Design a protein around this nucleic acid. Structure first.
Ligand code: DDS
Ligand code: CA
Ligand code: CA
Length: 348
DNA sequence: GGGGGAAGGATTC
DNA sequence: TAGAATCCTTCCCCC
């Protein structure tokens, strides 16, 4: 198998640059303004000019401005980025029918039927980069290898505006030398659980007792890492199906008052129904974010689709259930719909 | 901030 | 070698 992974560079900020070329060269910071107070909210993403100085996805807007007070701060326009994204994804389908859209700015292509070696792979990766730049004026990074995991790793090492092949030999090298923290699916919590077991590299997973590894990180991640370390990871390129659609809104103040919470919960419903488009959910979950930023969830599955009116009445009953079973104050409130009428995937 | 999947407990066959 | 499928909420990751 030969996988070609495409990752659009600093995507949201780059789209803003395309729509407003005067922004080119300047630090651009795309933000999610929460509405609590002035510049409350977080950075969604920043271009490389901003990131260079430490302004990155996840930091408070307040903190970003301390670092770069003169950067351009823009509100996230997801609808806009989604349309640009859709156009680029359509362009990629012209290079392979075996395509996996992993997110708004990431897609895997199985080009095993298209190319014979990694030299032609690299060439095809150049063609794709060139095509996206000419049609949309978007630069991307291409990662190429024998599977999805290493194709992603290649892109991670080569971004931005890059292209990298990790051949069979380099795959073996990385198994020995790559910090296991840099493997997709291993976040800070898993990395620390692993380090306490003495696993720092993929190769280390093969010598540790399996039940020790499993007990610590779960059977799934254990098997996953071992399959990688054995150079036997194979996961096919498959069409991802949206399984849930929702919205969580931040309230003006923390609250356990049903009447004060209701309007926010109802706005989340309205937005969520808009997003659903033609999808009809059979399941609804109310999701509360507590004052200490914990997450509490209660849901219901119906043997039928949920009308907006049923969503309204059920959501209150579910929020009442949360209020009863958790004494903490609620900071954010929202709703998530799933179990869509009519096929495989499409719900949870 | 949205959203997917696995962990782990409970249920039921 | 081994309860195991399934449903539910929490946990963890990532984009
Ligand atoms: N707190 C948050 N709020 C909203 N969206 C967030 C977020 N944290 C992350 N995201 C989302 C929004 C953007 C994305 C950030 O992840 P990458 O850095 O992988 O994507 P890109 O921006 O293209 O940078 P490049 O790929 O060139 O490194 O995740
Ligand atoms: Ca990207
Ligand atoms: Ca990591």
């Amino acid at each position: 198998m030969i996988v070609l992974f495409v990752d659009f560079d600093y995507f949201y900020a780059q789209v803003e640059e395309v729509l407003n070329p005067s922004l080119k060269g300047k630090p651009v910071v795309v933000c999610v303004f929460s509405g609590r107070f002035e510049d409350s909210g977080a950075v969604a993403t920043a271009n490389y000019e901003a990131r260079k100085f430490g302004v990155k996805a996840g930091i408070p807007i307040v903190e970003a401005k301390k670092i770069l007070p003169n950067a351009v701060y823009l509100p996230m326009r997801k609808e806009v980025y989604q349309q640009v994204s859709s156009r680029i994804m359509n362009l990629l389908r012209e290079y392979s029918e075996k395509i996996e859209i992993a997110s708004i700015d990431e897609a895997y292509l199985d080009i095993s039927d298209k190319v014979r070696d990694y030299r032609e792979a690299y060439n095809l990766g150049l063609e794709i980069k060139n095509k996206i730049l000419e049609k949309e004026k978007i630069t991307v990074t291409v990662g190429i290898s024998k599977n999805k995991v290493f194709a992603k790793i290649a892109a991670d090492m080569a971004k931005p505006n890059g292209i990298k092949v990790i051949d069979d030999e380099e795959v073996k090298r990385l198994i020995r030398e790559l910090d296991i923290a840099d493997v997709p699916g291993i976040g800070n919590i898993t990395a620390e659980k692993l380090k306490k077991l003495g696993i720092n590299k993929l190769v280390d997973t093969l010598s540790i007792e399996f039940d020790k590894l499993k007990g610590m990180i779960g059977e799934a991640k254990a098997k996953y890492l071992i399959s990688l370390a054995r150079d036997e990871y194979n996961e096919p390129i498959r069409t991802r199906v949206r399984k849930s659609i929702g919205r969580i809104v931040t309230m003006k103040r923390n609250s356990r008052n049903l009447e004060e919470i209701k309007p926010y919960l109802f706005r989340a419903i309205e937005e969520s129904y808009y997003k659903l488009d033609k999808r009809i959910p059979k399941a609804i979950h109310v999701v509360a974010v507590t004052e200490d930023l914990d997450i509490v969830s209660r849901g219901r599955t119906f043997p039928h689709g949920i009308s907006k009116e049923t969503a309204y009445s059920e959501s209150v009953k579910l929020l009442q259930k949360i209020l009863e079973e958790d004494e903490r104050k609620i900071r954010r409130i929202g709703v998530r719909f799933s179990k869509f009428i009519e096929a495989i995937g499409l719900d949870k």
